[PDB]
Structure formats: structure tokens, C-alpha cells
Amino acid sequence: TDRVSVGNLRIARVLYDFVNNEALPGTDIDPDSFWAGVDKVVADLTPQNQALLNARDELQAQIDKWHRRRVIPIDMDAYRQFLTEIGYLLPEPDDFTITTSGVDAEITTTAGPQLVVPVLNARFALNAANARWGSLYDALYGTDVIPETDGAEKGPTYNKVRGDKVIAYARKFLDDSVPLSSGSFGDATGFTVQDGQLVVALPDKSTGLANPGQFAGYTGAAESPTSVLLINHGLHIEILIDPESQVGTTDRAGVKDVILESAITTIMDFEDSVAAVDAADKVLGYRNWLGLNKGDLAARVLNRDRNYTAPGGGQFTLPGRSLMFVRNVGHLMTNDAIVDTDGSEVFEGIMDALFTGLIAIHGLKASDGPLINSRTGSIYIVKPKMHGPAEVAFTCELFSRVEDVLGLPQNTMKIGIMDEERRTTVNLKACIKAAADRVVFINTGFLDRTGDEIHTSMEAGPMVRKGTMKSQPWILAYEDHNVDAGLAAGFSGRAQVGKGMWTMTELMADMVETKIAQPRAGASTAWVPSPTAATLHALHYHQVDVAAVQQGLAGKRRATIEQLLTIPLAKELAWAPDEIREEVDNNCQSILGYVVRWVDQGVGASKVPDIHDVALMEDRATLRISSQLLANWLRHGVITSADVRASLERMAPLVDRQNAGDVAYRPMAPNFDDSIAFLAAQELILSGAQQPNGYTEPILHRRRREFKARAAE
């Protein structure tokens, strides 16, 4: 066929050529040696990869059977002893501190937003990489953070009343963040630098900063600067001065904009936010990841670092780019980009580590300017969907082997651990320990975690509704426990403690109001879906001193094993019939809305309107939750298969309507069983209870491959 033979492997030609012609040159790795390494690593580690997956299934079968033989509110003591007997719940290791070294300041020290985007989308990826600095005025004027009340609405052209509120909001932020010795930024008439100090002119007098150490730099003439640079909680704030701009001309000090350092780090995602089901899809992804690391990805282009004058008069530079992670896929899936002699597909996680690692070498050297990514010499890989410490140890050993193939020093490849599976949650300390010399973050992937919570306890009884899950005891303990485990392993000053994604892309007023809870909880980072959201979330890190919060949480134990293990079962007679229908409609709409873009267009993340037409930006995990929740309700007789059918039928034309204005869209209604997308949605629900750990990829990949093959002829 069209495959290349390397030992026991048969590699898709498009992948082979991409790696030879694009990825390898410039790395000084012998191509022959790389490919022999691919074959050897695959041969050596494939058996334990499979053994790990079989172990998952064996644990789940035992738990399924534990619930099925029980009639009695759970006896927690018994349930725990049981989880311990079967090896689900492992002993907690002794106290230790992580030793991870060679890590950039953005990760060890800086608290701020972390932006996650689909690596298949070059535009979004480039915009994300450039999102290290963002316009606060654009983010305020462009969103509902400033209410679109009467008089202040957005029109075809600039609205002065709204622009003045934007200005006012920012002046208030400045007062909160970098206070003057007296007076307010609201009344400033000019900025100058005198004797290395910022001098702010007010109408009656002049003043300096209450804390002059927050003055970081400036641009232009000291006596008439074009910008002033400030710093607060490790994050930079830049005031752009330009009275001959449309906004500056209206401004009392001629201020044009306030630029915030926003997306400090970015995760280029090969997993839940993309649809990649074969060699062609992987290659598009890998090529974008290459372009980012070489610095030559073009839609526009990547930003250079930013030049400043130091307060005393010297020159310095700040990074213009978000420091990049890459999120590889997890342990489950195989991909036909490589098959062995028997025709069996190779594990995709093993592939990603080899290829994303190889590609990452370019980000460690000069872009044909300075090197794009890690100055300290690390490669930052996020590893999702791991269950427990043996799976973390496997990932570390995988990275160890790749480092040898690639000629990198041991521990170059760092690991961002997603805590998004129950067996990792209740063994978190051991998971950190297994990666104690590689770990650069832990992060509560709460959506996947919810899916796994449902599947794990599928046989226990009917679960609460989807929108109820976020406030359940188990998840709130899970969030606290994650922070506690990180801090106790010495993450403060060493590694990020991260929390999850804000998915409501149009609800920015709400994000600003509520997401402050995450750095208040000691999270040094949290996820956002867009550069705009990164800029707004940045506000929270100026309001909250994360380093102090973490110092104050030290030694505390806020969650017990019992709370972590509290299954979210619905109480007796929880729902009226209309509330049941509403939940069914909600979940069917969520599934259909997501799956139609996934199967038909190969889109894994996008702005999808929900049932109430709220715009959501979720990844594949939302599908895992909804499919598992409906499977769980069907399993326990809350709804019937005809209820499911009827809701899918009702929701499909609505999804069809919601996708008007999509050039390539093809309706699901009314020819339902003509639509592969529709059949996928149905299959995800009806086979949901039988998917390993509730995972949606096996069905989703098959259906997308089916769609591609039909579209070919």
C-alpha cells in the first residue's frame, strides 16, 4: 500500500514524509536512528500500555458488581475497604517535595491565565500564542463586562458613552492594582518619569505610586512617554499614551489603552478540542505545532518580544509570546497513522510523545530571531485522562524512552498532570510522586472528572442532573484536595496549581464576577478559551495575591477521602416529569450540537449554542458527561428509550436551525438515519454504558472515519 516499513511498523506515507522533510531537519537527529527508536519504543511499551487499559476494565467490573449485589445509603467504611482490597485506593506515600528543575518562570512563579486552543486551527493557535499581551479596552468594549444598557450599546461605529465606561472601569482597575500616593488615576492629566520615578500629574498637584517599586518601565521620552509600564503580583500592566488616537483624544491624560499581560502560558491541544482520526489529521496538527515552535507559522504571524526603557534609563525586554505546552492524547486510543504487520493500530499516546517531542526541539533553538519557546530547555507536555499512579509512572517512562531516542537530557519532557479521573483524584499524592522530577502542573479537568464520576458509579443508581454536578460535595472536595496535594508537595514556587475552563464565551460579566473564586482558592492558574477571556481573567490575578493565598493554605487538609468518594446519586423523587424532559432535551441538544460539527466537519471545539441559546465553548468532555448521564438515567429507569428517541428528534431541527449561516452544514432532520452525525449521537447514548470509562473517542472516531469515507466517493 502507501505505507513505509520500519521494523514491525507500517507508517502512513504522509506522516513519514512530514517527519523526514519537515520535523527532523535542524534537530541534528539521525533520521534512521529516530525511526528505529519509534519502532523500538512502540514494541517495548505497547504491552504495558495494554495491561494498564485492561486493569481499568477489571477495576470497573468489580465495582459494577459491588453495587449490583447491594440493596442498602452507602456504607462508606465498607466501600473504602473494598476499593482498597481491589487496588483502586492505594496507600498514601510519605510527605515529599517535588524536584522538578529547568522550568521557566511563567510556570514556577507567575500566577495568571492559561489559554487552551485546538492545534488543528492555525488561526486560533497563532492568536493564542500572541495572547501574552492583550488590550483591556477591546476586551471591555467588546464584551458584556460593560453592560449593553440603553445608551451604551455597541453599534456599527464607536459609541462614546460606552467608551467612557470602558475608560472608567480601567481607571478603577489601576487604582485597585497600582495605587497612587494620593488621588486617583481617574483624574490624571499626564505621566512623566523623573529621577527614575513615575510622576503622575493631577489637576492640583502631582503624585508618585504608593509603591514606587510597581513602576517597571516606559517607552518614548521620559518627559513625554508613549507608554508607562507597571507591575503587580508579577504581572505587567502597560498604559499606552496617545492623544491623537480615537480614544486617546477623548481621554483626560491622552491615554489610548491599557494593555494587560494575559495568557502567560498556552496549551496547544491535540486531544479533546480537536477531531483527528487518521494520519492526515495528525499531520495537519503536527505541522501547526512545528510552525509554532520554529516561529514560522503563518495564517498572520507570531509576535516578537517587547522593548522597554527601565526606570533608571537602561534597556530591557519582555516576552511577546505565551509560553507553550502541548497536550498529547491519553493512554486509550490507537490511530491508524501507524499499523503493525498484523494491521493493528499503534497507540496514539506513544506516537504523540515521539512526534510532539521531536517537533518541540525546534522551540528550544533559534527561529529562522531568538528561540521561540523554553529558554530553560524544557518541553512541556500535558497528559490527560490518566487513572492512578502506575499510569503516571508509565507516562514518565514513556517520556524517558523518547528522551533517549531524541538525544535529550533526562527529564527534559515535563508533565502537566490532568486530575480528571477519579482513580487519580483519590490517589493524587502518589500520582504527583510518580512524576516528582517531571511535574510542572496539576489541573482539575472538572468536565472529564464528572464523566468518570458518572461512569464509575453507573450501577449505583440515578445521578443528579448535569447542571447540579458542579455544586456536588464530591467535586468541591476534589477541587480543594487538588490544591492541598499540590501545596503539600511543594508546588508553591515550583509548579502550577491549575483549575478548569470557563466555557460561557459571551458571559464575560459573569466570568469576571465569579471566576475570581479560582485564584482565591489558591490556584496559580486557570483555563480560558480565548485571548479576550485571558485578558479579563488576568484582572482576577491583580485583585488576588495567589502567592499569599497559597502560603496561607499550607498544611491544611480541607477534604477527606469520604467526601471525595461521595457519589452524586439523586435523592428519592428528585424531579417532576417536566424537569426530567428538560434535562433529557438539554443533554440531547448538547450531544447533537457538538457531534454534528465533530462528525461532519472535523471540528472539535467551537462556539456552540446550548438549548437556551447560550454560547458554550466546550471540548469533547461535555459529550462524555451528557452521554453518560443519559445512559445512567436509561439504565435506572428514569427515562425510556422512546423518551431518548423523541428528544433527539425534537432537538435535531433546532440544532439544524442553530447552524444556519454555516456554509458546509448539512441538516440532520428530517432524514435522521441518513445522518452519520445523528446516528453517532444515538450510538453515544445507547452504547454509553458499555464504553470503557465512558470514553466517547472509540465511537466518535469510527463515525468520523465513516463520514470521511462516504464523502470521498
Ligand SMILES: O=C(/C=N/O)Nc1ccccc1Br
Ligand atoms: O477545559 C478543558 C478540559 N480538558 O481536560 N478543555 C477545553 C479546551 C478548549 C476549549 C474548551 C474546553 Br472545556
Ligand SMILES: [Mg+2]
Ligand atoms: Mg479533559
Ligand SMILES: [Mg+2]
Ligand atoms: Mg438534580
Ligand SMILES: [Mg+2]
Ligand atoms: Mg497585593
